[PDB]
Amino acid sequence: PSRKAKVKATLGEFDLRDYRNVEVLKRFLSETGKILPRRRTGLSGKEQRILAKTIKRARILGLLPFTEKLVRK
Amino acid sequence: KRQVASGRAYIHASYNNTIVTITDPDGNPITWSSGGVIGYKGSRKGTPYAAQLAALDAAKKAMAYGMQSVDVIVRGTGAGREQAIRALQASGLQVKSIVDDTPVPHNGCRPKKKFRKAS
Amino acid sequence: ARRRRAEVRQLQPDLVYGDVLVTAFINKIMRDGKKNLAARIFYDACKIIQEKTGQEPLKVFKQAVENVKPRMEVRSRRVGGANYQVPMEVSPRRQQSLALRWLVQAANQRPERRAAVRIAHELMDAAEGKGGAVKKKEDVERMAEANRAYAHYRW
RNA sequence: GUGGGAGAGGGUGGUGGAAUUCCCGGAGUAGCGGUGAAAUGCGCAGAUACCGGGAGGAACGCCGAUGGCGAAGGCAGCCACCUGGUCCACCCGUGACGCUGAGGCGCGAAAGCGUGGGGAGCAAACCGGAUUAGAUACCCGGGUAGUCCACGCCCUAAACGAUGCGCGCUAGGUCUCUGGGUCUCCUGGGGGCCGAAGCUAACGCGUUAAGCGCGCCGCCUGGGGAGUACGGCCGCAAGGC
Numbered sequence A: 001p002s003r004k005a006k007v008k009a010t011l012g013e014f015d016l017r018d019y020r021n022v023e024v025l026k027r028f029l030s031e032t033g034k035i036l037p038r039r040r041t042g043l044s045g046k047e048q049r050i051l052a053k054t055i056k057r058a059r060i061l062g063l064l065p066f067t068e069k070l071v072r073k
Numbered sequence B: 001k002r003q004v005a006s007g008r009a010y011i012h013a014s015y016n017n018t019i020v021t022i023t024d025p026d027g028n029p030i031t032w033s034s035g036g037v038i039g040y041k042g043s044r045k046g047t048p049y050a051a052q053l054a055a056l057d058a059a060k061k062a063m064a065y066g067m068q069s070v071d072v073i074v075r076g077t078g079a080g081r082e083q084a085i086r087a088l089q090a091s092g093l094q095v096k097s098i099v100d101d102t103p104v105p106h107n108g109c110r111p112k113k114k115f116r117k118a119s
Numbered sequence C: 001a002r003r004r005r006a007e008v009r010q011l012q013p014d015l016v017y018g019d020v021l022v023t024a025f026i027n028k029i030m031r032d033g034k035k036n037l038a039a040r041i042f043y044d045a046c047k048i049i050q051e052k053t054g055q056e057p058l059k060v061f062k063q064a065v066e067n068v069k070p071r072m073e074v075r076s077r078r079v080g081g082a083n084y085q086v087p088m089e090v091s092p093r094r095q096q097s098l099a100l101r102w103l104v105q106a107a108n109q110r111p112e113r114r115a116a117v118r119i120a121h122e123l124m125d126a127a128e129g130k131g132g133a134v135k136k137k138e139d140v141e142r143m144a145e146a147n148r149a150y151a152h153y154r155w
Numbered sequence D: 001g002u003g004g005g006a007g008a009g010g011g012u013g014g015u016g017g018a019a020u021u022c023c024c025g026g027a028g029u030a031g032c033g034g035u036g037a038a039a040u041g042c043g044c045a046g047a048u049a050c051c052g053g054g055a056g057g058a059a060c061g062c063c064g065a066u067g068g069c070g071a072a073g074g075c076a077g078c079c080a081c082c083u084g085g086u087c088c089a090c091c092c093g094u095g096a097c098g099c100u101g102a103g104g105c106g107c108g109a110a111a112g113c114g115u116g117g118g119g120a121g122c123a124a125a126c127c128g129g130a131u132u133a134g135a136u137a138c139c140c141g142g143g144u145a146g147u148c149c150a151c152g153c154c155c156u157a158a159a160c161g162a163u164g165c166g167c168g169c170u171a172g173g174u175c176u177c178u179g180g181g182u183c184u185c186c187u188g189g190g191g192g193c194c195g196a197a198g199c200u201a202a203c204g205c206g207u208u209a210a211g212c213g214c215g216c217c218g219c220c221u222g223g224g225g226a227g228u229a230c231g232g233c234c235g236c237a238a239g240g241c
């Protein structure tokens, strides 16, 4: 449904190319370290495409997770 | 025999049988049970009831060691798995938390024919 | 009954007790549509639960049925060439049907030669908690349980 | 030419984490696994389940699409280097330098072939369990070639849009990717759907033509025999044309 909000509208401006900005970046992953889809990241074909490479960069550097444990169930 | 109080309850669900493994605070197994451990021999170890019985067997056996609360960690997708959870919840043991940790590749080994054809 | 859910055919109250359950029980006894001899047998049975019990027959009757009622039963259901015995709840309607039917059944398996004796003694042992009727009830409930494994085929 | 742009386009090196397997340690005990049921099989020389460490090979979750790139085959973890194509703006330079293309040369998925290496998982053949009237199968347990790398070869395909390339002309609507602009929209390149005229045996196609036209190549000429025989060329072979 994605009736929640858009991760983009839920914060100000930011350098999508900044792979060390853990703060704003982690804001784009799900409960699990998975990269949120546009229906929820509120990004654009192009924007969302860069987030992709940024997040992946931070991941290797050890700043962002490749995966998380689903708490609850 | 070595009173552990709190620990970990691991549920390993599957389409073929369930098996719970209680461990101490850092992964080491205190006691375990399964659909086989109990009476069920074949097609019903997977059955949700078997899941219940097994989870409960894990409880008792674990309670004897003087345990009274554990974190549940579910792995796998299988018939009767939430039953194990519900079981442990009623087992007496306090279910501190629950967490699915089923492993998934990021695409490693070619699955057997039985599991191929996915998209 | 493919169209609409059948009507629970309403029965007329008992002439002697004004109870519908009694009639029902009387009907299960009746064969070849001989309601007289049917009604008779039952009443003589009540009179016998007297010369032998300081309790009112109807009291006995009611309690007898209540004990022969199964609360769980097995019903088949195919799922891969092999049909499993699925245990499920028994609705009151059938719960009652099965009880009365079983009473008259067990009763007629009995050795006493006279009809009303067989029925009174069965009603009697019924409330007591023993006898062939209550037996069937128990063998049944045993069938469920013995199949909890397949309970997940509720429906 | 100058200034800009998006891209899984190609080559080389490096590197990340998830998972499987195997090995080492810990803890633990009676099964695990598998199925419509089962059995073969694995486990008290201690398996399955669980925690820690290690080794190795292969693939790259989410992003991910209606997406993008390429002439096709085909191409996505991340980083760097090397390199191809291409789009837009400016209107700056050359001055018809153009289109097509028999033969030629190059590329060309999978399987297959040669030498060497590699080998985690998968799995032709094969070894078994089950099903069945039988079961040289479908299901289950194993398992070799192979699947991976290098170098050489093979050249096929539902190699498909079953639609050769180029150019000009002929309503629009809507979604989308990427660029420019005076940016609730105009303009350009690409991806979809609906539809004007028109086309079509029909289904359908319809500015991404299967419309209206010009240029050049390729190809068809009832079915079976047959993609066979023969011959030739190519290939180590299998075979290919």
Ligand SMILES: [Mg+2]
Binding pocket: C001, C002, C006
């Ligand atoms: Mg009916």
Ligand SMILES: [Mg+2]
Binding pocket: D092
């Ligand atoms: Mg000029």
Ligand SMILES: [Mg+2]
Binding pocket: none
């Ligand atoms: Mg001049």
Ligand SMILES: [Mg+2]
Binding pocket: none
């Ligand atoms: Mg040419």
Ligand SMILES: [Mg+2]
Binding pocket: none
């Ligand atoms: Mg090739």
Ligand SMILES: [Mg+2]
Binding pocket: none
């Ligand atoms: Mg190959």
Ligand SMILES: [Mg+2]
Binding pocket: none
């Ligand atoms: Mg080879």
Ligand SMILES: [Mg+2]
Binding pocket: none
């Ligand atoms: Mg070799």
Ligand SMILES: [Mg+2]
Binding pocket: none
């Ligand atoms: Mg195998």
Ligand SMILES: [Mg+2]
Binding pocket: none
């Ligand atoms: Mg076989």
Ligand SMILES: [Mg+2]
Binding pocket: none
């Ligand atoms: Mg096999």
Ligand SMILES: [Mg+2]
Binding pocket: D164, D165, D217, D218
């Ligand atoms: Mg041509």
Ligand SMILES: [Mg+2]
Binding pocket: none
């Ligand atoms: Mg359009």
Ligand SMILES: [Mg+2]
Binding pocket: D183
């Ligand atoms: Mg713009």
Ligand SMILES: [Mg+2]
Binding pocket: none
């Ligand atoms: Mg267009």
Ligand SMILES: [Mg+2]
Binding pocket: none
């Ligand atoms: Mg467009």
